Amino acid sequence: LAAYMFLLIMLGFPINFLTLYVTVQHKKLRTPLNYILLNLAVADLFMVFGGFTTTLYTSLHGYFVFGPTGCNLEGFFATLGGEIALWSLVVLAIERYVVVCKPMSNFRFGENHAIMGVAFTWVMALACAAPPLVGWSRYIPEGMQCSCGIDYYTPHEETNNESFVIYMFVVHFIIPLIVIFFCYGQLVFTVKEAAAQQQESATTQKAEKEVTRMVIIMVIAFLICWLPYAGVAFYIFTHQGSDFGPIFMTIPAFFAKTSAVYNPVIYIMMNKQFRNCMVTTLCCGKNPLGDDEASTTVSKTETSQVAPA
Numbered sequence: 001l002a003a004y005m006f007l008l009i010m011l012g013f014p015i016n017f018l019t020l021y022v023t024v025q026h027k028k029l030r031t032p033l034n035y036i037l038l039n040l041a042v043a044d045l046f047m048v049f050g051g052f053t054t055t056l057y058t059s060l061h062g063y064f065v066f067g068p069t070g071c072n073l074e075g076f077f078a079t080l081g082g083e084i085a086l087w088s089l090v091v092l093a094i095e096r097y098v099v100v101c102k103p104m105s106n107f108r109f110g111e112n113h114a115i116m117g118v119a120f121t122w123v124m125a126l127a128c129a130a131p132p133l134v135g136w137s138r139y140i141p142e143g144m145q146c147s148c149g150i151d152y153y154t155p156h157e158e159t160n161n162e163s164f165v166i167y168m169f170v171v172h173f174i175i176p177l178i179v180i181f182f183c184y185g186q187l188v189f190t191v192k193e194a195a196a197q198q199q200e201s202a203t204t205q206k207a208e209k210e211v212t213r214m215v216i217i218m219v220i221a222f223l224i225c226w227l228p229y230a231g232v233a234f235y236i237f238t239h240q241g242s243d244f245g246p247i248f249m250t251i252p253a254f255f256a257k258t259s260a261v262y263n264p265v266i267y268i269m270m271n272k273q274f275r276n277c278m279v280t281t282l283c284c285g286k287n288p289l290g291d292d293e294a295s296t297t298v299s300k301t302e303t304s305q306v307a308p309a
């Protein structure tokens, strides 16, 4: 595995470099909709803790085995490293969305709760600590966490798979999905809304028009894995290999390593710097005539202005 980890946690880093500069680039004016590279700093930098250091050093060849921990990009930083993306998109997706999901909540603060859902976030990182760590200490369980082996995992992996496949789900792509939908009914105020994510979505304060590329990606961000894998990930993680689920994994662990590709999910920058703009040159893009080179802070007295752009 060490060099599918370069094919594709290198080239993953550092075009997660020219991605993961960029929410340490300034440390942004973080957070916003680039909390996503503060969430996916602790989740696509930690997906390098991960695909360099320990899951590529000690981490799984390299090492090992080890353990370590959850494997631990896989148990930890792909909870975080995909969980956090499920979240980072129950917000983005559909941060059409946040702001019209919700109630724009104060004129902000349909920030949410996404800032404050960043405190929901470790709410499901103390709550993907809670089962998770007492997932391992449900006990061996601590199978491919500690072992990286067994022997609940398998006699009887159904609780254990059969609860977390069905435990993150249980709710985590149950209501959210059903809640979470609905203002993914701000996805029917979005299906007619790319006339809104176009003009209150090429123009709802922050980074957005291309915001509408919103949902070119964000339901292929749904789909990209998490349609063939909501398929071959639910049914996979009935788990049931020995020797065919894994292996098979990779493929079952490929597209969430081609969803460690925060590249066409930084542009989606977009998102702070595709608005500011309005202007003379170029696109990504915000009306578009030109789109530049305007707004900047406050968010403008001129030339691509003030709810800019």
Ligand SMILES: *C/C=C(C)/C=C\C=C(C)\C=C\C1=C(C)CCCC1(C)C
Binding pocket: 074, 078, 079, 081, 082, 083, 084, 085, 086, 087, 168, 169, 172, 173, 226, 233, 253, 254, 255, 256, 257
């Ligand atoms: C690269 C390896 C990965 C991403 C390993 C595990 C993936 C998950 C625990 C996926 C969680 C999710 C599910 C089941 C459904 C909604 C989307 C999701 C990514 C949060």
